[PDB]
Structures are given as structure tokens and as C-alpha cells.
Amino acid sequence: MREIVHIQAGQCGNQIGAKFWEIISDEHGIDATGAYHGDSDLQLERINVYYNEASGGKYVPRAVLVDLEPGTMDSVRSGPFGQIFRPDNFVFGQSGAGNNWAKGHYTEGAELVDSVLDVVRKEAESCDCLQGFQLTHSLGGGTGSGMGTLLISKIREEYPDRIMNTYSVVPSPKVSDTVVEPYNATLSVHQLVENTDETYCIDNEALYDICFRTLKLTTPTYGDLNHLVSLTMSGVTTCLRFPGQLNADLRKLAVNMVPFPRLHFFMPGFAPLTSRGSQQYRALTVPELTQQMFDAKNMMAACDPRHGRYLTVAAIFRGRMSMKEVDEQMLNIQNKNSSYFVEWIPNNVKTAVCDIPPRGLKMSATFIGNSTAIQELFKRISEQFTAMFRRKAFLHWYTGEGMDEMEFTEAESNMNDLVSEYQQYQ
Amino acid sequence: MREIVHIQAGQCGNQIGAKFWEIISDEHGIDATGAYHGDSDLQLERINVYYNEASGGKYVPRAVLVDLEPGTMDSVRSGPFGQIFRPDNFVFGQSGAGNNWAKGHYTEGAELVDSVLDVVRKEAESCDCLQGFQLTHSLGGGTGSGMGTLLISKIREEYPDRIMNTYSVVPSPKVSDTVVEPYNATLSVHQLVENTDETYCIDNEALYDICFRTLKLTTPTYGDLNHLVSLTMSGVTTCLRFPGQLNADLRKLAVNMVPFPRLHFFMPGFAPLTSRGSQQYRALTVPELTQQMFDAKNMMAACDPRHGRYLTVAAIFRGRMSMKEVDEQMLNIQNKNSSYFVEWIPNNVKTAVCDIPPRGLKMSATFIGNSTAIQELFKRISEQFTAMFRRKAFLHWYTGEGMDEMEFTEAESNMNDLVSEYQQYQ
Amino acid sequence: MRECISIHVGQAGVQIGNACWELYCLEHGIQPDGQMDSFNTFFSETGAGKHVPRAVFVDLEPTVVDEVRTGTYRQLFHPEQLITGKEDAANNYARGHYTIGKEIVDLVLDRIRKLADQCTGLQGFLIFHSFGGGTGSGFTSLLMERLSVDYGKKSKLEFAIYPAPQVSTAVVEPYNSILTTHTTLEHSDCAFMVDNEAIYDICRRNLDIERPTYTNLNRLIGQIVSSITASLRFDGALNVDLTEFQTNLVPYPRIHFPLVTYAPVISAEKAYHEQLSVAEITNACFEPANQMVKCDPRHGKYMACCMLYRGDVVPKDVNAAIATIKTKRTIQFVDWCPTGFKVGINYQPPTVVPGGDLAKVQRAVCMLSNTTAIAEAWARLDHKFDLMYAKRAFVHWYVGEGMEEGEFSEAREDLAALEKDY
Ligand SMILES: Nc1nc2c(ncn2[C@@H]2O[C@H](COP(=O)(O)OP(=O)(O)OP(=O)(O)O)[C@@H](O)[C@H]2O)c(=O)[nH]1
Ligand SMILES: Nc1nc2c(ncn2[C@@H]2O[C@H](COP(=O)(O)OP(=O)(O)OP(O)(O)=S)[C@@H](O)[C@H]2O)c(=O)[nH]1
Ligand SMILES: Nc1nc2c(ncn2[C@@H]2O[C@H](COP(=O)(O)OP(=O)(O)OP(O)(O)=S)[C@@H](O)[C@H]2O)c(=O)[nH]1
């Protein structure tokens, strides 16, 4: 029931999806091979949403692995929990777009679109009812963005009624890892305003600073980023996967977060996040989390909501507490953060609770909010695009793949209209 | 309930706050790590006023550590009871104002005000009801005074209804430890007449002489000063922390001590203070303390009240005795000290008793009094300021931080008006 | 059948109410939970072998309420009649009268109103508080006028802990005392004495307790209220109602401040040393030092005298002793009040506590009058107020609660007019 098919693009996307899958194996009591060992019926009652009916009392993730190179392929398969995936879900290229959107979308994507559509259709038909999709990729990378755009386009033209979310990784503003990454973000967003119902923006430097300061780690790594990503993962999907006094699903969140079809970018959230010698001393209560719900420190996608205005807030909780405390806390949050909040969307806090807490924590809290802070990020991206497109630098790589000038012109015009609409809302 | 947040500024302030915290760990039965081992329910019934709810049956002090240098930071954390504080409360600078008010208030305070406000707001919100604040710093030092002024200003603009007291350390008149310390005292007092509800003046040489003569020690140290400071500590806060037949709090004392908003400087007191071979021979009775309540020997802030006139007196007691003896003793104190007392404030003795005595002493007595003796200290400070400001010496350091002439002029005018009002009361 | 309501405000009020309920429970045999028809004047019949006090415990600070709800009598008291505050006025009348009192007066008004709803025989109201306490002054006063406006001519009795001339917990006590006295004067049907120093002196010299504690004071109030309410809670030869108490001692609304005294206060070892006869106990009680008031009544004139005998006391002996009291010249009365004597006889002996200072005795008398010596204390308080307000000290504290000095001044002149009305 309400089956969700996972598709992962790029090396970062593949690592994120894998880490998710081990986290789901923890949450649902699944070992490294696939056998179930959970101590409660709640883990295994709704295992079919992310697993399929496997013979011998086994379960395999409903995942699709896509890449243009088998290097991360082999590392993921040979890594932990690599035997839980059938070899068929691993489909890879042999060239690699080299961080180019046009190459991965047209040149090498031409011979991978058939495979990805075949596997996603097999996953959809082999299941009872596909509630929606979830994709992970990086907009900074060129190939991963191209696979994301191609898959969202094909899903929209194939399943226009089935909603989804895309967990794209926007490149960090502070670091220019790829010279042609502004093109990648440009084209990915131009396709996202058009083929995606809602999108969460995940920015690198914000999670980097969180791991550095909030978690108090001197050696941040991709592992902690994937861990927090998997926490966001579980926080969003626990309402559908696990029983709750206030049951919710991705459709509820999409209805509660999208006021306009083009206004669908939101910035996810997780809490509490404390270290060993603070957790045993911190208050394990709701106020310690509500002071952590709204802050630029434990903040996800690097643009401060204080400068802008929140559109609406969604809060999911997992633990043992009553509901009225949450309601009064949300009311106090409005009362004190009225200036930072929007005046014409009263009671803009979406409140739901999943009964089952995650493994190892008796609360986790996932802050799903939307603010006009992403306007700054989009405007900076647009001005950067104008800056190095005025010089017409690095255009040859794209024009060699069948590109054109005014195409990029309407792309930048689309982001201009999007940022203008967001400013008008502000 | 009635939670109090402690903020410590400067090396002396950090040492004082630490020593307080070990003394509170003694009084409330808390070990070096944080576990409770008190033999009575009275210690642990009101532990939440200075401690927070920590997991694993632990408790951590409600303290905030602020400095511009990590040297005393490391010594305090590596010293006794250093593990009872979470690493988050330790926030430090890296430059150091170098005993300069302007530097620590504007240059280096600009990048510390955000951190200190964030931590104090976290402490306020994570608690049930913040009754008030308590700050420790040294007016002789430049940075500590600047942090004191900045924090009192921010608290006044943020929590104008929540009262507090500041336990500032006025520089000793006899010794000029810092050449620019008159500027520090000037600016600190100019901000205290304006951002602080009440202040206790703690002078060095008076406690030095007490340790030398009254305690009969040939080697006075900072440890004994911090010990007597922690006794004052416990004496003021025991009425709120511990049950009493005459319950009291800091609000009661503030109401009983402040006749005018600008007239809020008081001079704390402690007794009895006797050595091993005098305690076993002295009378452990109230008269031995009432002869010790009013004396220039066991005297706190180096200005003799005999020259001036007492405004009003507050006396808190902790032990096993009846109340009428205290009342008649206070009446006799008036009867004999009428000349030293004020004629137009009848029955100016504030009488309250906390049932629970401090650990190791079956009485302690904390003499909270106000007299026009501080007029001499303030007038001497004002004339010193005039003396070395007429020469315009050492002004370059302050003017390089964004200072100005008539600003200091209205500062000295404010102390002139304050001393004139105190003389008018006299 | 009939009932009465007791009101407790502040630390002193809460402690006094707890002690009085301890008396009423041990006198009628109530175990700490509420089990084993005159006891219905203070307890309500619901269910099976159940009684709860008809009282409200309210204070701006939750310390005393927490202490009450931690005793073995948690089951005795309903939880909902205990009210916990958050911001103590800290000996500030204005703070507890405006800042915190105004937003918590509603629930208490509101539900004491139900306490009257199920008590159709409501004889009156009992109020216990302290002038020195800011809560016990401000909140008590405001609820007093609220009682007056929500009940009209209903009888109301006040028990106030007036700070002693040389005993004052707070130096700002004159402000609270004058303010509350001026505020509740017109509505205070009857307000008594409590002198803490006089209580200590009597306990140290009569009970010979060199080291007494506020428990002695608590039953000092407890025995006084028990002797007052024995007529309502037990039959007698001539029972006295609350209405007659204010009828006798308030011919003019201005003067309604009588002092109280008990007889005797004798320990068990000294109770072996003295058995009570009417003449000796009355003449001892009429002695100024035996009074728990630090004002010599012989300085002025006597308004009226009321006797509350309890136990096996002969009315003829009462009349003879009272007459021989009258003839002696140490006792003087006003010219226009020759016959101001009311005697209330009850057959219930005074009740003892285990481990208490008082000794278990079959008879007792309560000393009840309004002497002119109260004018001395009022004048001294007014003089202290004039001295300590002349330079306008601690006024800014009341200013921060939002009023200017005028009301202070006209309260001072109102109490001066009260003082010179004698
Ligand atoms: N006789 C008697 N008086 C008491 C007792 N306990 C407290 N008091 C009175 O209470 C006064 C002390 O102030 P409180 O009334 O307790 O003030 P509070 O309860 O803190 O209320 P706020 O001042 O508004 O904060 C003293 O002056 C006493 O007169 C008691 O046990 N016996
Ligand atoms: N949080 C997180 N970020 C990652 C991880 N791996 C890579 N990234 C980020 O992704 C960005 C690169 O995206 P990537 O997917 O590697 O591009 P690509 O186009 O797929 O690269 P290629 O296959 O053409 S060679 C880098 O900025 C890097 O910081 C990861 O494991 N966790
Ligand atoms: N009683 C007491 N006084 C102290 C203690 N430590 C320092 N002092 C006093 O404080 C004064 C110096 O204040 P201090 O806090 O050190 O200045 P500062 O501005 O913070 O110094 P810096 O950090 O810029 S280098 C000296 O006069 C010294 O006597 C102490 O532990 N106990």
C-alpha cells in the first residue's frame, strides 16, 4: 500500500540513498541481508511501503540506482548492506557527463532514459499502489541534475497525478566546486519549476556548519551529512510508515506547503541535535526543541529566514507527550515570532505527530517550513549566471551537446519571474 | 521555578562564579560531577533555581561563562568541578581588551554580544520562570566592566520587568592596579545608574584586611576572597533556595533597599568570621553576631559608614533561634546606634530568617545595609577622574575605539549628580 | 444547618488556615484523609465518610502552597482549592493589588462563589492574612472589596497579622499597612490583633517556652478562632452569632478594630500547678501583659467587653466574676457605653493537640474587646509613615506599579482622621 519508489542520481545521491536504506533497516528491524528481527509489530506492519515481498521471509528496498559511472556503484554495493539490493536495480553508464547538465541529459542520458523508465515502471506495476516518488541528486553536479530533470519530466508525462518530492542538493554559495555548476542549477531549476510538485532545498555549508558547531565535531565528514539526511528521511516518512494519533503522509504535507504551483521550494529541518555531554545535561522536553525549531544555527539551506518571511510551517513529532502542549507552544511561537512570520496566513503551523520515535531517540523533530529566504539564494544564482554568461565563457561544452542561446535566456527569465513572485509575496 | 541565570565576566568574575558553584554543590549535596547525594529533601527540593533538569539523575549549574581570552577558561574547566558545566556555556574571545572599557564594549564586544544574548535567551526560555539575574565582574578591569555594561543594557532592553543584582568588584582606592581603571569605573557606573536595578559594591582592600586581621591569616589569597564571596552568595540566596519561617527573595530585598532608582548601591555583609582557636572559645550566640553586624573591621566596601548615615539595614539569619530575640536586638541596635542611623527612616532593619543553615556552620549572617559612606568612594573616584582627565592622558586608547569628549563629560556629570544626591540625603 | 467560608492569603494566611483546619479536623476526629452534624459548618458531606475544608488557599508565591500539598493532609484537602502564584509581591501592596492580583482574583472570586452556592446557610466569611506581606495586604484587600460588592451586607471577619511596633519583616511595612487599612476600612466589618512580639513574650513567660516556633503562633490563632467559632460549631447556654459580634462592637462604622486575648496559656506541668476558676482566669486575662497586644489598654477607655466561655462554666459564677471585675477601678468604660457586656457560654471544652504547648483543659474563656490603646499603635504607625515618607523613600517601587504619590498622602490623612476620631 502507498508504495514509494526511490531513485538516486549522482555519487552523492547514491550515498544518501544507501545511508537512508541502512537507517530504514534500523527503524524497521531489518538486518544487513534483509531478514526481519524487529521486536514490535509496528516496524513490520507497514514494511511494504519501502520493501517488496521477497521469498524466504526477506525484504528488499524499493530503490533504483542510476549513475553514469560504476565507481560509486561498486563502493555502494561492496559497502554495508550491499546484499539487500538485487543486482538488477543497479544500472550504470560508462562515459560520465563530467559535471555537465547537457551531456548527462542528452548525450549519455539518451541511452539511460530507457533503462530508468523501464525499472521505474517495473517498480510501479509490481506494487499495489504507488503513492509517490522520492529522488535524491545534486544540483551542483552536472549528470545528477540531468537525471533528475529527465526523471521528473518522464514521471510528469507518465504519472501526472502521483505527487512526489525531490531532495536535490543545491551547490554551496561559498564554494565553487564546479565552474559550470551555475548552468547545472539553472537548468535543473528551470525543469523543477515545471516537472516537480514540491522540492526541498538542501545546501552544503549550512549542514557543514551544523556539524561543526551544533554537533561540536572538529572533523565533519560526508557520513554525518548522510546521517542527518537520513534523519530527515525518517522524519518526513514516519507518519506514513508508522501509526500515529495524527496520521499524515506526503500528500498532506504537499497540500499544506504549496500555495502556488511555482511556489514549491522548502527548506527541511531536524532536531534535537546534541552531543554526549550535552544530552545528559540538556532538557529532553518540548521547549528545548521549540527554541531549536526556529534558529539560524540549526538551519538547513543557507539563507536566513529572518531577513524574509515564513510562508507556513509544518512540524512532525515522534514521542510520548500531549498534544495541547504542542498547540500552546505553536501559539507562543506565533506570539513571539510574529514579525518573522506572515501576517496574512494565520495559524500557519502544520501540526502532526507520529507515535513511534526513531531508534535510539525517544524524540525526533523534523521542521518543514517555507520562507522567502530562498529568494536571496535564487537572486544570487541569477546574478552569477548573468555575470559569467555575459562573458560567454564555457558555453562551448553545452553548445556541443545541442544547446542554444535563447533557451538559457528563457531559463534565466523563468528564475527572474520566480524571484519576482517570491519578492511580491514578501 | 524562579530560575536565576548566572553570567560571569573577567578572570576574577569567572573564579568567583566557579567558587560559588562548588559552594552551591556543597549546600545542595552535589558532587564534583553533578550527581545528588544530599541527606535531606530540603537541598534537592529547590535545586531547579540554580540547576537544570539533566538526564541520568544529574544537575548542571545555570551559568554563563564569558571572557575575551581562554586562559582562565582552561584553568576553570580543568579545575575542580569543571565537568559539571556543559562545554556550550563556555564562550570566549581571542583578542582581549587589555583592561580597556571601550575595547571590550565596542571592538571585541561586538562579536561577543550575539553569543552572550543567544546563551542568556536560551537559558531564559529553557527554564520555567526566570526570577532574575546575577552577574559578577570587576570594575577595575576593562573588559569585564564592558561585558557587565553591555549585558545589563541588553537585559534592560529585553527584560525590563525582571529585576537583578550585579556583584561588581570596584577597584581598591589604595592600589592603582590599572592606569586606565578610573575610566573603567566611570563608564561602568555611568551604565549602572541606568541599566541596573540594584548593585552591591565589593572593594578589595576591605576583604584583604578582614582576611589579614579578623581571620588572622598571614598569607591572604584569592581563594579566601572567593570563599567569603560565596558565603555572601549563599547568604543572599538561601531565603529563596531554602524554606524559611520568614521566606524572602531578591525581589523583597530590592523593594526593601531601593528608595530612589538612582540610589541603589549597597555594601553586602557576612558574619560570624572566626578562626579555629577563637570559635571554640567565642560565644556562638546572637549578641556575638550583633556586635559583628555593625563594625568597620568586618566591613565590606572600603568606606566607613560612621562618617555617613545608614539608609536601611537588611539582616538574614540561618539557624535555630526565636525571633523575638532578633527583634529586641535590632531595637537595641537602633537604640545605641541612633546617631549612626537615619532618624527619618524608623525601624529601618529588614528582618528575615532562613531555616536551613549553611554546610559546616549552624549560623551564618549576611548583613545587607546601605549607608552614605559610598559617597566618599564616589567623590574620590570623581576627583581622580578630573585629575587625570584634565591632563588628557591615556585618552588615545579610548578615542581609537570610537570615543568622544563630552560623552565622558556627561558621565562625570552623572556621578556628580549622584554624589550630590547622596550628600543631600546625608 | 449552616456553613462558613475561610480565606487564606499569603504565607501567614496559608499557615494560619492550615493550623485552623488542623484544629477543626482533630477536634472532630478527622484522619488526614477525611473520615472517622455541627461539623458541616466547615466540611461538606459527599459520598461516604467524606469531609473537605470550605477554604481557598491562594498566594502570589507557590512555596507555602507546595509545603501544604506535601504534608500528610494532601488527601484531606481538595487539590483544586489550593492556588499557586508565580510572582510574589515581595512586601509590596501595589504589586499584589494591581500587577498580579488583578489577573488571579477572578478564579478565586469565582469559585468561592460556588462555595457559597452549595452553602445556603453561609453565616459569614473568615479572612486570614498579614499586613506586612505584600500579597496578604494587596490581594486580601482587593478580594475584600470584591466580597463586599458581590455579597452586599454579608458578614465578613478578618484576621490580620499586624506587624509589631519593633517587629517588622520589611522596612516598607508602613506603606503596605497604611494602604491596606485605608483601602479596606469602609468594608472591614471586624479586624483583630496579632502582635508577634507579644506572642513570643507570652510564650516565653507564661508557657515558659524559651525556644518557641511559629507552630505556637499557629495555634495561638487556632485556639482564638476555635473559641470564636465554638458557638457556631457547638451548642451552648447562650450561643453567639457572627452578626452579633459586629452588632455589639460597631455602633459606628469607623471603629471596628477590636483586640483579642485568650485565657489561659498554660503548659501541662504548669496545668498541674493551676486549675481554672472563673474569677482568677478572667482577672488574669484582663491583665495588660496577658493580652497578646503590645498596647496597654489602661492608657485609654474601654469600648465593650465580650466573654466566650467554653466548657463547664456556671452562668451565675460568670455574672459574679464579671461584676467584681466591673467594680475595680483598673477597668474603666466610656460614659455613653455603660452596659456593653455580652456573654457566650458553650458546653464544648477546648480541644488539645498531641505535642502542643497548650494543656488539655475542660474549660476556657476568650477575651474580646476594643480598647482605646489601639489608637496608640495607629498613631505610632502614622508617625513612622510620616518620618519614612517625608523624604519619599521606597515610593518609586509603588510608582513602577503605575501610580504617583497622591493616594499615599490621602491614605495618610484618612488614617489620621481615623486616629483623631477617638
Ligand atoms: N504570627 C505569624 N506571622 C507570620 C507567620 N508566618 C509569616 N508571618 C507574617 O508574614 C510576614 C512576612 O511576610 P509574608 O506575609 O510571608 O509575605 P509573603 O508571603 O512573601 O507575600 P509577599 O510579601 O507579597 O511576597 C511577617 O511579618 C509575619 O508577620 C507565622 O507563622 N505566624
Ligand atoms: N552531503 C553530501 N554531499 C556530497 C557527498 N558526495 C558529494 N557531495 C557533494 O556533491 C557535489 C558534487 O556532486 P556530484 O554528484 O558528485 O556531481 P556529479 O555530476 O555526479 O559528478 P560526476 O559523476 O559527473 S563525476 C560536491 O559539491 C560535493 O560536496 C556526500 O556524500 N554527502
Ligand atoms: N577577590 C578577587 N579579586 C581578583 C581575583 N582575580 C583578580 N582580582 C582582582 O581583579 C582586578 C583585575 O580585574 P580583571 O578581571 O583581571 O581585569 P580584566 O579586564 O578582566 O583583565 P584582562 O582579561 O583584560 S587581561 C585586580 O585588581 C585583582 O585584584 C580573584 O580571584 N579574587
mmCIF file of C-alpha atoms and ligand atoms in Angstrom, chain B residues 9-13 15-16 67-69 96-100 137-145 147 169 171-172 175 177-178 181 184 202 204 207-208 221-223 225-226 229, ligand 3:
data_model
loop_
_atom_site.group_PDB
_atom_site.id
_atom_site.type_symbol
_atom_site.label_atom_id
_atom_site.label_comp_id
_atom_site.label_asym_id
_atom_site.label_seq_id
_atom_site.Cartn_x
_atom_site.Cartn_y
_atom_site.Cartn_z
ATOM 1 C CA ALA B 9 32.785 38.401 33.262
ATOM 2 C CA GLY B 10 36.538 38.735 33.631
ATOM 3 C CA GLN B 11 39.018 36.372 35.240
ATOM 4 C CA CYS B 12 38.012 37.431 38.756
ATOM 5 C CA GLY B 13 34.336 37.063 37.878
ATOM 6 C CA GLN B 15 36.805 32.468 39.507
ATOM 7 C CA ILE B 16 34.114 33.909 41.795
ATOM 8 C CA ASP B 67 35.644 36.092 28.585
ATOM 9 C CA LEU B 68 37.795 37.674 25.896
ATOM 10 C CA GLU B 69 40.619 35.167 26.480
ATOM 11 C CA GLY B 96 41.393 40.584 24.985
ATOM 12 C CA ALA B 97 40.534 44.215 25.681
ATOM 13 C CA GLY B 98 43.671 44.630 27.800
ATOM 14 C CA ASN B 99 41.866 46.305 30.721
ATOM 15 C CA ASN B 100 40.082 48.748 28.392
ATOM 16 C CA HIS B 137 32.638 41.201 37.142
ATOM 17 C CA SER B 138 35.356 43.653 38.166
ATOM 18 C CA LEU B 139 35.077 47.385 37.564
ATOM 19 C CA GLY B 140 38.854 47.717 37.819
ATOM 20 C CA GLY B 141 39.234 45.528 34.756
ATOM 21 C CA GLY B 142 38.379 46.990 31.396
ATOM 22 C CA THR B 143 36.854 44.081 29.531
ATOM 23 C CA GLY B 144 34.811 42.748 32.465
ATOM 24 C CA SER B 145 33.236 46.139 33.066
ATOM 25 C CA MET B 147 30.661 42.984 29.372
ATOM 26 C CA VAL B 169 34.266 44.483 42.078
ATOM 27 C CA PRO B 171 38.986 48.733 42.248
ATOM 28 C CA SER B 172 40.757 49.302 45.544
ATOM 29 C CA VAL B 175 46.302 50.444 44.846
ATOM 30 C CA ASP B 177 46.448 48.165 39.510
ATOM 31 C CA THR B 178 45.442 49.651 36.142
ATOM 32 C CA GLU B 181 40.856 51.782 35.600
ATOM 33 C CA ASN B 184 36.531 51.679 33.545
ATOM 34 C CA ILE B 202 32.690 44.839 46.647
ATOM 35 C CA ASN B 204 39.302 44.618 47.565
ATOM 36 C CA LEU B 207 38.206 41.967 52.388
ATOM 37 C CA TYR B 208 42.021 41.870 52.306
ATOM 38 C CA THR B 221 44.868 34.707 48.876
ATOM 39 C CA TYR B 222 42.218 34.973 46.183
ATOM 40 C CA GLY B 223 40.803 31.694 47.488
ATOM 41 C CA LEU B 225 38.171 36.188 48.945
ATOM 42 C CA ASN B 226 36.206 33.834 46.693
ATOM 43 C CA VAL B 229 32.141 35.994 48.242
HETATM 44 N N1 LIG D 3 38.729 38.907 45.083
HETATM 45 C C1 LIG D 3 39.358 38.582 43.958
HETATM 46 N N2 LIG D 3 39.866 39.574 43.142
HETATM 47 C C2 LIG D 3 40.507 39.251 41.994
HETATM 48 C C3 LIG D 3 40.664 37.923 41.623
HETATM 49 N N3 LIG D 3 41.333 37.896 40.449
HETATM 50 C C4 LIG D 3 41.602 39.166 40.072
HETATM 51 N N4 LIG D 3 41.094 40.016 41.019
HETATM 52 C C5 LIG D 3 41.162 41.487 41.009
HETATM 53 O O1 LIG D 3 40.582 41.997 39.825
HETATM 54 C C6 LIG D 3 41.346 43.072 39.311
HETATM 55 C C7 LIG D 3 41.610 42.859 37.827
HETATM 56 O O2 LIG D 3 40.397 42.553 37.178
HETATM 57 P P1 LIG D 3 40.379 41.572 35.904
HETATM 58 O O3 LIG D 3 39.087 40.858 35.797
HETATM 59 O O4 LIG D 3 41.517 40.628 35.986
HETATM 60 O O5 LIG D 3 40.601 42.595 34.681
HETATM 61 P P2 LIG D 3 40.365 42.171 33.148
HETATM 62 O O6 LIG D 3 39.962 43.366 32.372
HETATM 63 O O7 LIG D 3 39.359 41.093 33.028
HETATM 64 O O8 LIG D 3 41.811 41.672 32.649
HETATM 65 P P3 LIG D 3 42.010 41.186 31.127
HETATM 66 O O9 LIG D 3 41.152 39.932 30.871
HETATM 67 O O10 LIG D 3 41.574 42.311 30.172
HETATM 68 S S1 LIG D 3 43.648 40.818 30.860
HETATM 69 C C8 LIG D 3 42.643 43.142 40.100
HETATM 70 O O11 LIG D 3 42.674 44.333 40.849
HETATM 71 C C9 LIG D 3 42.608 41.949 41.031
HETATM 72 O O12 LIG D 3 42.969 42.338 42.335
HETATM 73 C C10 LIG D 3 40.156 36.920 42.438
HETATM 74 O O13 LIG D 3 40.288 35.740 42.123
HETATM 75 N N5 LIG D 3 39.504 37.255 43.607
#
